[PDB]
Amino acid sequence: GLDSHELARLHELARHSHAVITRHQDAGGAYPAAPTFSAYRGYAWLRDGSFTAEGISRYGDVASAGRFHDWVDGVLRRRRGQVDDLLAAVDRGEVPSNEGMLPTRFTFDGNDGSDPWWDFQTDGYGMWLWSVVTHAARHGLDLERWRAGIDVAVDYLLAFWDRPCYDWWEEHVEHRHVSTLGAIHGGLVAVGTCAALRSAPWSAATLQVAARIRSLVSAEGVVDGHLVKWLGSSAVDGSLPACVVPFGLVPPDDDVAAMTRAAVAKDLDVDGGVHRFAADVFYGGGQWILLSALLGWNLAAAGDTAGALRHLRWIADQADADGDLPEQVPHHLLHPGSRAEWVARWGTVATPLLWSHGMYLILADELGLLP
Ligand SMILES: [N+]
Numbered sequence: 001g002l003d004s005h006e007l008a009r010l011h012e013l014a015r016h017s018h019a020v021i022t023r024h025q026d027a028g029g030a031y032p033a034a035p036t037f038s039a040y041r042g043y044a045w046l047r048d049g050s051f052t053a054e055g056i057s058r059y060g061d062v063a064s065a066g067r068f069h070d071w072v073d074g075v076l077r078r079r080r081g082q083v084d085d086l087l088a089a090v091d092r093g094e095v096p097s098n099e100g101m102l103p104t105r106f107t108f109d110g111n112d113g114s115d116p117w118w119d120f121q122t123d124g125y126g127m128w129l130w131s132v133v134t135h136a137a138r139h140g141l142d143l144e145r146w147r148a149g150i151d152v153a154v155d156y157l158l159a160f161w162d163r164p165c166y167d168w169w170e171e172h173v174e175h176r177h178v179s180t181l182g183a184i185h186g187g188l189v190a191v192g193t194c195a196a197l198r199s200a201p202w203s204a205a206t207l208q209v210a211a212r213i214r215s216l217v218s219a220e221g222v223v224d225g226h227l228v229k230w231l232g233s234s235a236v237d238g239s240l241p242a243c244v245v246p247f248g249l250v251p252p253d254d255d256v257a258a259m260t261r262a263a264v265a266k267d268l269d270v271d272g273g274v275h276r277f278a279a280d281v282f283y284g285g286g287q288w289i290l291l292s293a294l295l296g297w298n299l300a301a302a303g304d305t306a307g308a309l310r311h312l313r314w315i316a317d318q319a320d321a322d323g324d325l326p327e328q329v330p331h332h333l334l335h336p337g338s339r340a341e342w343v344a345r346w347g348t349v350a351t352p353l354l355w356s357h358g359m360y361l362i363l364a365d366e367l368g369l370l371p
Contacts, residue, residue, distance in 0.1 A: 001309065002369075011371050013316050014059070014364050016323035017357035021052055022064045024354060026108040029071030034327070037350030043105040043113040046072065046124030047168060047183075048355040050131035051290070054246075055361030057135040059370060066141075069132045073149030075110035076128075080148075083156045090159055098165070098173065102156060120165045120173060123180040125153045129187030130246065133194050143196045154191055154202045157184050158209055162216070167230070168239050169276055175230035178221045178249075179239035185213045186247030217249055225259035229277060236263045238276045238291035241298040252302040261298055269295060270332040272314025278334065283342040283349055285334025289315050289325050293359030300366040312363050315356075325356035 002010065024035045030044035031052045049068055057065040079102060089096050098120040105113030129150060136143045143150065161184045167177040191197050192206035220231035227249070229237035241264055243249040244257040251257060268275040273287025274295050296311030318329045327350040333339060364370055 001305075006313070007369070010312070010316060010364060010369050013319055013323055014361060014370055016319075017055065017325075017360045017364075018059050018061065020324060020352045021056055021354050021357055022061060024352075025064060025067065026071075028108050028110075029067035029069075030106065030108045031068055031354050032108075033355065034350035034353050037327075037347065037353075039346045040350055042107070044071075044108060045105065046128045047121075048353075048358075050124070050127035051362070052354045052358035053131050054134060055358035055365075057131075057138055058365040059361050062139050062141075065135050069135060069146050071110075072128050072132070073146040075106060076149035076152040078110055080152055083152050087155065087159055101160070104166075104170075119170050121168070121170070121180070122157065122160055122163065122165050123168060123177075123183035125157050126161075126180075126184035126187035126247075129153055129157070130183070130190045133187075133190035133197075134246075136196070137194075143194065147197075147200075150191060150197075151200070151202075153187070154200075154206060157188060158202060158205055161188075161209060161213060167237070169280075169282075172230060175233075176216070177230045177237075177239075178217060178227050179229075179237060179242050179247075181213050181217055181221070181231075182240075182243035182247040182249050185210050185243075185249055188213075189248055214249060217243075222256060225255060226263040227256060227260045235278060236260070236267050238264060238268050238274045238288060239294070240264055241294050245298050245301040252298070257298075257302065261295065261302065264295060272311050273318075273329060273331060274311075275332075275334055281335045281338035283328060284330060284336045284339030286328035286330045286339075286349070287332055288328045289318055289353070289356040290327075290359040293356075293363045296363045297359075297366050300363065305367070308363065308367055312367060312369075315360055315363070320351060324352035325360060326351035327353040327356060 024032055031049040033040040033048045053065045053068045086096050099117040101116045101120050103112040103116050104119040104121045107113050132146050164174050164176050166173050188206040188210040223234050227240045229235050240260050274291035292311045292315050296308045300308035
């Protein structure tokens, strides 16, 4: 495995990952995406925050992870009326516009940070349900602390899970993305199998809807034995291993899990750095730390320690002078011509990206390498 040279570098990157996350956590509890990146600064995402919260919970900082769940919970309780209004609209056959839906970007005070016409996404609500249930399980906590916010998220997701929306990458609003469906599935199975939530009025409905998601992925989201980026597509996306671990469309040992890991590695992994999708022109289509971390987590869960380690080492080699992990690195670019216009508009690549550090902590934990 690892000599004490490697073990010391990996331990130090874990401790720094904890530090950069808790130091930039907002006073209100939110985890920001990236404190210094022009286009992300001032906002919080449930997707980034939930994976960040899971790394922090595995690290053992119950206080930090708890303030993030408090923040999300309170933000969702404040949307109780908005969600009830959307459901009542649906019940009158007046299907609301993307412009009326719950937001993607939040301000640290829980307001919409963006107009959901331009970035409507449902995955973050499903990831938060997964995150808070897994945190409560790990540390023996009472979910009643966050139940009223869970109720808002469940109600919203049971109504809107099958709606087209933008993918994790804010593209293709017309499509139903398999990693978005996967995130919602993980959240619903998390609350539906949670003994502390056995009397919730939605308990049975969450597992019936999770089964409806798996039926749709079965019918339109599997080609040549692997998951695909969106229903009706042949291609893969770097986010797809999340549909195995942790969101559980299939478990690690399933043939579709194996074929999906192999398709993602062949089509999108270069020397341990995982690309998002073939067409990606964002900063030239670089190699994403969080996606290398996600593939590595999935190889670990499937019993491929070696492959997991190789991805962890690749990630650790992208750490900068201070131990900060960027969003992505340009060692291999899918569309090199496009990088310059992105550096010009938005600046140097987001560094640190909190989600990079969260995913680092998860993969390190899966390999038993936390201090
Ligand atoms: N695991």
